Symmetry: D2
Subunit: 388 residues, 4 copies
């Protein structure tokens, strides 16, 4: 009946989302720039919990140390005036031309060292503002051609970079953790660590893996045609879902950054179901772009719809799981047996169990239907509010 | 000039590849079944090194222990007569109806225990035949709908299954290692561990991770639109490329299993370049299907073309890397600098280096071109044999 | 409140849909075959209007003329007993091995002539049973390799085949029309006439184009990543939507044939909105497969869900369009102006209109927002039943 | 041995290709702007035949009639100095913010009239410069959401626009033809007329269809996963290939605009084979972007590689078709029979031919292999220059 967000729902937005001016690779900006202070005030009025930023969203590139203290001071006063928080920050290592072949894995060694110094400068600012997560999206780490990048040497350089950042925050005593954001392509023809799985595997080779997790994005995994709730489950299973970027995507094409709930609606339902039933307690961060067709009233409408659709889906997924008819269908489909160990009795007792092989009636087991279609139609009816 | 394979090139084929009868989801078989003994003899004549099998390719399902010893004896005599080896084996946990919801992660616990016993029985046979790698492709582990599979519980069951198989081979003293083969979809709507990255990350949570690697397949990663040479580089970087399945795929669609070299030809070039320059020494295994348009002469022609195209690409990639003009272009594109540590001087010296930030001339660095297009055209000229 | 289908909703199902035994390219059948008579009775009980068939679903291949009259007689008695109709029929030119390189565009001329005779025999039966539409899905017309098929010669053969079928029905005086069903791939690597657009363009070169339309399928166009409601609008605009196949598909991958409403739910909403507002009056035909996880109770559950989801979406799209708040938002987004001619005043008056160029204020026009995000959130709220 | 282009090879380039400054949706320009006069001179030195332009590439938007005559005069003097021609021109209806919801199908009627006047002004200039083809790429005609665009009304507006342009060139007596360029998405979420087929079908509903053809682009059709040589064959079959845009694309993702020959190399081979064997005589136009990693030496290297790869592939496809071994394999695969009419004897003689049905031996026909794998390996050997 009521889908009004409050700061306790932990909804957050990047400054670059509502602040996107509408420039795309075929067209000029359609909106004027927004002052960060205005975005903070506007988002607070809509019920958001907080904002996030890249260094260059908040402090224009090439700013003097004095212009920098001014930009931060103004920002901090808007945070104090509104009660908004800053739970995550990140570095822009993709817009300036010096990063055209990457930041941490640029072929030029001087660019790699510059990228690390630009990053470290912003981790200190993030800690000052109270961020608990520092995201890294290596949007330019990759290649358009095969010979341009030796990927084993580039992974050595990427490991070296994250290892030095871990050393830095530990030597400084900071309580901040890192989250790597995978994306398969765009703007490079192929990007390194293209999916949540490749990022998870990479983290296990860092020197201090407990400091690093993932920041998956809905549309990124869908650009590889993957099931985003399945990848989030794997990240939760590994203990590494540190943050999450929510938006919508219609399939395998350029990154559309639609508002959350747009794109694949059923996948959004199953995602909310999983985050709420696993008790994910981090921010619900929207990394989206209001389409360039819109004026500023459409920007705020689009941001409000992100939060509204999360809260509708949350109510429908909770109704689904609480429905005794669904709980019976889950048992009929043997979800309860999936959660039981296959062989708590141990290897030797499995080997000696004739009911597991010699005397197993495979034709009788094969004839049992799984009853998944009736379960899925109950899930559809709940999503559409069609229960009777 | 000569592209004739010999058993030293380590080319291997599954019995199910040349033995595929042509049944697809819309049509009946177009070829008669082949006897395994005939395939071994035919493949040996073409210059192959060895063959691989699923348990049910070699021993028809529901065979008595006596019919089983007969099937194996005949097979072993063809191996002895030809000099062919058996470097890898695997289990069929996908064809029989009992596996319709999976083997290791089936919701029904009795099916999960049966899948493990069927697997263990075939590991013993594989060891008897001298296989060094045991592959697992969980083709039915997955779902068509969101509520049918809790993925955290399914990963617990998958970990449990691989952990028990590791216990078994260690308690038996066997020198065989496991390779997990990822695939993103087909025949399930989404398959668990869909890419090389998700498999690599999963392995790091097994109790004895050193026993497990990956068996990536060209067409599988391309069904997610990913760069297969990049994923192989990541697997090599992690020390986990235990085996590899070679074939061709035209993009994101059903798994075509074309012969190797078909599909994305430039990706095949960069793959061969990487395997030969990293010194991969395992089998070059072809997991492909001769199209159902072909008769048996076209089957053998298709198998021969797999090996021929590998050896042409091997010669062109070696000519590329040996060309002094290419070696100069690699330096011009700073591939030599990519291989140097970013900061061997350490964190504190990076922080105190003004040339890395305060005094870094970003506009001069940004203006340097990377010269990647001339390098890539040298690579194209070498691939096409157009050097002058 | 009520989503119970009746025969007036015109829901139809192919015999091969609920009758699919579950054989996929990696696994054996999981269900027994269904007798056509049982499917007709079962579907009638669920509220369906009618059934469709391929020749070989109803009469097993290689049946004697006498076994054939028997199969038809039994079928006709089930139709009479239930009131079910047969609005469409089609030919199987894809399952038997003789069709491995196609029916109408097979390279072998004798196969092409056989395909036409098999087709003509079944058009006569379809007319006898009262079908008004004859569908053609050229599932084997295509190629896996470039040199195997000269596509201009194959389109000449396809045109020749459809032209002879048009001559046949006109010389016989039959009132039946043809509908070509496009698909981009599977089971051939690329299929000719891969999308609704390529089929529409081809029809305009037939000798009697008024006899031919399209039979688009939801999942087929989504296998090319296309917007299915947009392609249906183009077909309606051309006067050629003769029939439609409804199902669900999760993106670009093998053809999943999920029940309608599954897959891309928002696209299903916009499709129903368009069919009901354009007054499409043909059958709502479901071409889907109950997943092979299911037993026969899950088959009927899946078929019922096809109809249920159509009727829920129909009610939500009608509520959307009738909502005065939506009608105001449509005007705010200038959908009313889109429907007005750009230049009913004619070319010369446009050329002399200074307000159209010399004096057009482009900056003022560019600043107007289109208000599409608020319209789309109204559409989301209606779909989810969240209006307040 | 020699792959040096000359103006007789008819290679052409858009000003916006080599002139692309490197701005992408995540980053700033990496190259300075090029003066059109410099590009003409540079391209002439490389062996190009001519250049193409959008109105706004040549005359900056908002130019006075006097600044406009100056820009044209300078350009014309570079054309005269170099011998370069201008065979095609087009309109930019996508960059300025006023076109954010489209040009010809914008919801706002005043924008639609402005788009037509901007177009007509540039057709006159194109004719003055001697262009024979006028291209239209409706990059902003489309939508991100379902309710924003009624597609039947938008196709009425698109037809109205092209019909008025046809009236204009006929009333002026101009000898120029139009070519519509389809693209499936980007920058709109879905673009109207998304593929060559949808454009071909649309043209048949214009009032003077003989004035309109298509301008297909390699990467555009591959963004829908379609076979570009098959779509070009259909366009040639319909008599509508008026122009062609050549580039490379790695699969279904954002439009990469790689140089021709990059991306799918085998598809480039089959495309060149078809254009040269069908005797396409229009321009070979490159619509590509040198990657933003490159400096100006890499721009010219990338442009040269476009032409080089066309000429290598042309030589390999001509060697393929001329090889007597290939000509025998084409007969073995019955390509000669594909080109023969199925039933030149007519419908009645087909119906009375018992050898076409009653007495057709389907099992003997089904057993004949098509020999396509050996043909395809001959095509691979020719492409790689590996014939022996
Ligand atoms: O606009 C780029 C986004 O912002 C952050 O860098 C990351 O979340 C990216 O997806
Ligand atoms: O035909 C299935 C293949 O064989 C093995 O199970 C694995 O390599 C799969 O890709
Ligand atoms: O199972 C194949 C389907 O049945 C008809 O041949 C056509 O609608 C195809 O999509
Ligand atoms: O950069 C856009 C291209 O230029 C022309 O407008 C058309 O060919 C598009 O593909
Ligand atoms: Mg994104
Ligand atoms: Mg993000
Ligand atoms: Mg495969
Ligand atoms: Mg494999
Ligand atoms: Mg289908
Ligand atoms: Mg269909
Ligand atoms: Mg393009
Ligand atoms: Mg173009």
């Amino acid at each position: 009946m009521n889908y009004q967000p409050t700061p306790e729902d932990r909804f957050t937005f990047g400054l670059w989302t509502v602040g996107w001016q509408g420039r795309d690779p075929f067209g000029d900006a359609t909106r004027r720039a927004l002052d960060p202070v205005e975005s903070v005030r506007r988002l607070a009025e809509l019920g958001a919990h907080g904002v996030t930023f890249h260094d260059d969203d908040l402090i224009p590139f090439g700013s003097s140390d004095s212009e920098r203290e001014e930009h931060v001071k103004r920002f901090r006063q808007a945070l104090d005036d509104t009660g908004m928080k800053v739970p995550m920050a990140t570095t822009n290592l993709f817009t300036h031309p010096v990063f055209k072949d990457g930041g941490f894995t640029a072929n030029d060694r001087d660019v790699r060292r510059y990228a690390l110094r630009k990053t470290i400068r912003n981790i200190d600012l993030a800690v000052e503002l109270g961020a608990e997560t520092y995201v890294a999206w290596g949007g330019r780490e990759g290649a358009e051609s095969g010979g341009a990048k030796d990927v084993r040497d580039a992974l050595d350089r990427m490991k070296e970079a994250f290892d030095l950042l871990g050393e830095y925050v530990t030597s400084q005593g900071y309580d901040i953790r890192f989250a790597i954001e995978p994306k398969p392509n765009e703007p490079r023809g192929d990007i390194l660590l293209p999916t949540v799985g490749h990022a998870l595997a990479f983290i296990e080779r860092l020197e201090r893996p407990e400091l690093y997790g993932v920041n998956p994005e809905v549309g990124h995994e869908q650009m590889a045609g993957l099931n985003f709730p399945h990848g989030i489950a794997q990240a939760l299973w590994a203990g590494k879902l540190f943050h999450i970027d929510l938006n919508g995507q219609n399939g395998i094409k350029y990154d559309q950054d639609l508002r959350f709930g747009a794109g694949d609606l059923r996948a959004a339902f199953w995602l909310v179901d999983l985050l709420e039933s696993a008790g994910y307690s981090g921010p619900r961060h929207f990394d989206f772009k209001p389409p360039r067709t819109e004026d500023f009233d459409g920007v705020w409408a689009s941001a409000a719809g992100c939060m509204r659709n999360y809260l509708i889906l949350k109510e429908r997924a909770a109704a689904f799981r609480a429905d005794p008819e669904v709980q019976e269908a889950l048992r009929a489909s043997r979800l309860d047996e999936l959660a039981r160990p296959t062989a708590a009795d141990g290897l030797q007792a499995l080997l000696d169990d004739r009911s597991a092989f010699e005397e197993f009636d495979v034709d009788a087991a094969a004839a049992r239907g799984m009853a998944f279609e009736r379960l899925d139609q109950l899930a559809m009816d709940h999503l559409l509010g069609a229960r009777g």
